[PDB]
Amino acid sequence: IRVFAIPPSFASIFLTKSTKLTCLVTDLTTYDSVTISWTRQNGEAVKTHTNISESHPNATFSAVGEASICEDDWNSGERFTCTVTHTDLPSPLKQTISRPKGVALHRPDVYLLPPAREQLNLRESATITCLVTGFSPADVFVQWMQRGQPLSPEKYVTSAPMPEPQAPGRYFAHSILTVSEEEWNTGETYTCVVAHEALPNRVTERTVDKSTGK
Amino acid sequence: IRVFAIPPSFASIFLTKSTKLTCLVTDLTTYDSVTISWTRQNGEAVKTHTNISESHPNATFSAVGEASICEDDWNSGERFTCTVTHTDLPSPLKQTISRPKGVALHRPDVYLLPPAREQLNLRESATITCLVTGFSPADVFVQWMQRGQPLSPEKYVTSAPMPEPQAPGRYFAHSILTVSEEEWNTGETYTCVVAHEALPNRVTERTVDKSTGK
Amino acid sequence: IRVFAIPPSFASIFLTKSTKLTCLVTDLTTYDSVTISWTRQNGEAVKTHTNISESHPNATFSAVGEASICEDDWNSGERFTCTVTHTDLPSPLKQTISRPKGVALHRPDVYLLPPAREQLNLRESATITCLVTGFSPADVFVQWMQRGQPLSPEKYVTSAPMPEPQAPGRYFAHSILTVSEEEWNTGETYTCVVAHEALPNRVTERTVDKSTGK
Amino acid sequence: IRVFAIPPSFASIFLTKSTKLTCLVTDLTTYDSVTISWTRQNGEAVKTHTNISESHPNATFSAVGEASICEDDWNSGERFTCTVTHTDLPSPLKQTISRPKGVALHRPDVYLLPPAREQLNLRESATITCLVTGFSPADVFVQWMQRGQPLSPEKYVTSAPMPEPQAPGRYFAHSILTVSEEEWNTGETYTCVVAHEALPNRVTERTVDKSTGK
């Protein structure tokens, strides 16, 4: 029985085009008359509450906290919390949700890697990785395109940003794309963009063909 | 005030080269008169119990249950549990520790990929990517050797094995090995053995070099 | 009329995935009333001794002594011998069954060698061989797998461990996989794993292709 | 106490350039005044027994029984035993050695394999193997050439010939040459030769270079 705190991961904020700090409950079971407030330690209204999601009764609740907030105001670094005024939990919960300060914005040195000879001698799949490397902010979102048309995570997956061991301050992350080898062997561009807050343009892209990778 | 059930992770059992099943407390901070033993539902004890690691660096007591168990009996589907005779928790917590045989037997199709030409061009780093793919049991231990001597875990870091975007049952990890640009452009070979129980060999590997980097 | 001692060879323990030490009679042709036991220098017996064998088609009885032994205490080197209590030989025989503890721990520097053009000149066979070199402990189990599936020992066959000519303390083996030339030249990969007890991962393998070598 | 019979294998016929049937005691620790005569119930050929190599340095005597006889007479398949009339062993033993007269014919399919392409990166010990397969006799003598000059047996190790897995009537062996990569990459023609019994040529030979192998 605890209100889960969900800081806005850059993946989610670039999926929904807006920063999203929420307080969704995870282990909270069926308790009717859900009264959960969105106020700080001083008391302030909600920044344009929108996108109410239904509470699926499958042994959990969905305490709505979704809101659209300006990215500049998000990067200004304001302290805010989701106090709990529910009947089950009357005591407030301290959920300090903001980007980790004391951080140097280091852009992701992005290296897109075509597959090696080991898929050329098997001809079953070409798992092409857009390995992002060396960026101090942890969260990052990697998605791909065929030409300019984006590609869904049903063919690819962005691995979690576990830290880089050579530079403890920086992190890295990872992402693949698993499709047929023939579709990659047509000389068609798989252009992986990399959304990150430390980039100057906030989105940088690399492309590989059958000839771009040597 | 709860006891965690640490199972033998395949990474830890190949780190110590032995199956290590333990009943280690996590939230027990300071309570004397520790009495811990291994009694199962049938009523037999383990061969030995020793090698207590005293206390954590934090003020938290650690009481491991350490015994020598062969890989064959662990893989055969044994049923042991660690009773809680300790004074603070007189009720024995049910901790059924077993190797999950519900997973299938899919070997890691390892696709080791060389770093990008851009990774070369930046003249800064060289991250060599052991991109494994498609093993239905998740737990793997991917460690690297420069020529046969394993590197420290502070050099290679393996991604937690997350499902393949195509096959849900088949998992894939991804262990980079971040070094300097010169350390890979000097033609240094890089092998990454992928320890996994579903393999008939229990260890498979690929190699990468400038010659095989297309 | 002599009771032979069968120590657990690394090849057999890798074949059956368990360490098993027996006292199997070889010179005992036909002598009934077999009541074998296991008494060491202390008062300890086997954990489980079952599946006895009565007789062979030839005139040689097979009194097996298979048991489940833990790898950890096998490596630590517990002393255990099979006492002989038989009508023919009532006198017990001392059989100190353990690996030589005084020996180096040097991993097999494995090299996988593709066949030369002389092999493809005849178009009769193509034997890719697994040149393993320099492993100080005794036994290796070098089994082969094309693609990923291991082959039967009727297609590959490994050399018995012979001393390495450079280091007297380090041994040597050499294991073929004689497949057909039409099977080899179709892009089919060939890998060979090397089970050995001084490897940090206990198994190392190399891969070869026609495109791999020059 | 036992007496062992050492047949003259194919190593001797190319080492001393003669066949040397022997009967050598192995377990005989200390028993002086030996009475040995190389006699049979039907004496046919004894030749010479004029050389005795004193005693072994260890706790055993060396009563060598060498006899350099005609090669054709040894290949004809004659039986000759070493009966023991010693005081310690009044009962004669069975020391029966003779080459199998009925053996099929098959050339040694020798194929010389240069080491792995990654030996250029290892720079520790390049090992060229003289991969010989499918010779119908049990044993062959594989030695090496420094541009045509024999190498020492402490430099090359000849793999013990076990049966070829394709046909039980054929056998295969090896011989590696632990040399340095620096002297291998100077264009040194590393040459191996394989001796043989059933061939009309009896010596086959292959050469390897950097350019010879593909």
From Swiss-Prot, chains A, B, C, D:
Effect of T186A: Has little effect on IgM BCR assembly
Residues carrying covalently attached carbohydrate according to the record: N51, N58
Disulfide partners: C23-C82, C130-C192
PTM per Swiss-Prot/TrEMBL: N-glycosylated; important for IgM secretion and its localization at the plasma membrane. The interaction with FCMR is glycan-independent.
Leader peptide range in chain numbering: none
Residue intervals of the Ig-like domain: 8-98, 108-209
Effect ascribed to mutating E197D: In IMGT allele IGHM*02
Region named CH3: 1-102
Disorder named in the UniProt entry: Agammaglobulinemia 1, autosomal recessive: A primary immunodeficiency characterized by profoundly low or absent serum antibodies and low or absent circulating B cells due to an early block of B-cell development. Affected individuals develop severe infections in the first years of life.
Complex formation: The basic structural unit of both sIgM and mIgM molecules consists of two identical heavy chains and two identical light chains; disulfide-linked. N-terminal variable regions of the heavy and light chains form the antigen binding sites, whereas the C-terminal constant regions of the heavy chains interact with immune receptors to mediate effector functions.
Name this protein carries in UniProt: Immunoglobulin heavy constant mu
Organism per entry: Homo sapiens (Human)
Whole sequence portion shown: 222 to 433 of 474
